[PDB]
Design goal:
The chain has 314 residues and is of the alpha+beta class. The chain has two domains: 174 residues, Streptopain (SpeB) (Cathepsin B, Chain A, Alpha-Beta Complex), CATH 3.90.70; 108 residues, Peptidase C10 family (Protein Binding, DinI Protein, Chain A, 2-Layer Sandwich). It has five helices and twelve strands. The protein has a ten-stranded antiparallel beta sheet with strand order 1-2-3-4-11-10-9-8-12-7. The longest helix has 20 residues. The protein is globular. It is classed as hydrolase. The entry lists the keywords cysteine protease, bacterial odontopathogen, hydrolase. The assembly is monomeric. The entry is titled "Structure of Prevotella intermedia prointerpain A fragment 39-359 (mutant C154A)".
């Protein structure tokens, strides 16, 4: 008999643990749907920056709904148009520190970290096991604002990505070849995205427009493209999500603090999306995004971009 145990509470949401294991994020307002998110993973406090963004965005939309006395929308996938549901596609639980960042410069304040955009992109590329090799080469610098800083380079065109050595989970045991396989991919995804690298307490930040450009140029994803939510109604945006996942295409999603980014890799019948936050599996689960309508250019909800068009070729 599953019961709920309060773990954490704000004025807009409460995190409740489940006695069978897992947790839910719950609202309490006539203008919001009650269940906001749900995970099979037990809740533990985590630095997960992208989950932190999502909580701030939820708080913002709920408070704005209440102020404007407008119910939050609930958008469900139409099974006459899309798959009824798409269960979580990714098997990886990757993150931004060791061994993912093994190939990045060390600093007296800790080794540079991969960046959420790189971790999300690497997990999507690994899902497809594509490309076989990249194209060309590129260098960024640390600090990013110094053209003559420490060079961080990727030779994509001479790299055969070692897909067979990409482990799902690096939180316990792994070999050096498995560490190098994923670290190479992480470094290349960052350099391709024009990453602005930083140590553990600063983070590493990239723009989705640069992620999409680098995916075209250095990885050969001809169709890769960045789009931003402010250009779409909620219904139009969720139809893109449902259509892409129905086709088996996980989505790099995020926005810009070194930003937030994650992978949407499924959805359920009630329209919650499966999210891989790229924080070692911490709090991965199903979460609402339909109700995150973009606000002014300065709101948390305005920070929602996606890169679509990433998949193998016929």
């Amino acid at each position: 008999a599953n019961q709920l145990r309060e773990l954490k509470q704000t004025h807009t949401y409460t995190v409740f643990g489940y006695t069978d294991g897992g947790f839910a994020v719950i609202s309490a307002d006539d203008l919001a749907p009650e269940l906001l998110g749900v995970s099979e993973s037990n809740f533990v406090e985590t630095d997960n920056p992208s989950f932190k963004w999502w909580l701030k965005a939820i708080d913002e939309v709920i408070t704005n709904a209440v102020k404007s006395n407008k119910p939050l929308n609930v958008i469900k996938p139409d099974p006459s148009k899309y798959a009824a549901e798409v269960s979580t596609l990714l098997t990886t639980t990757w993150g931004q520190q060791m061994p993912y960042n093994k190939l990045l410069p060390k600093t007296k304040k800790g080794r540079l970290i991969t960046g959420a955009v790189a971790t999300a992109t690497a997990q999507v590329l690994n899902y497809f096991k594509y490309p076989v090799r990249g194209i060309g080469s590129h260098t960024v610098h640390y600090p990013a604002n110094d053209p003559s800083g420490v060079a961080i380079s990727a030779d994509f065109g001479n790299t055969t990505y070692d897909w067979a050595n990409m482990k799902d989970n690096y939180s316990g045991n792994y070999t050096e070849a498995e560490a190098n396989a994923v670290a190479t991919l992480m470094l290349h995804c960052g350099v391709a995205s024009e990453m602005q690298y930083g140590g553990p307490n600063e983070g590493s930040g990239a723009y989705m427009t640069d992620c999409a450009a680098g995916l075209r140029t250095y990885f050969g994803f001809t169709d890769a493209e960045y789009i931003t939510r402010a250009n779409y109604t909620d219904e139009q945006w969720m139809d893109i999500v449902f259509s892409e996942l129905t086709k088996g295409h996980p989505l790099i999603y995020g926005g810009v603090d070194a930003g937030h980014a994650f992978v949407i890799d499924g959805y359920n019948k009630a329209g919650l999306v499966s999210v891989n936050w790229g924080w070692n599996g911490d709090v991965d689960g199903y979460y609402k995004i339909d109700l995150l309508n973009p606000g002014n250019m300065y709101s948390f909800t305005a920070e929602q971009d996606m890169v679509r068009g990433v998949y193998g070729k016929p």
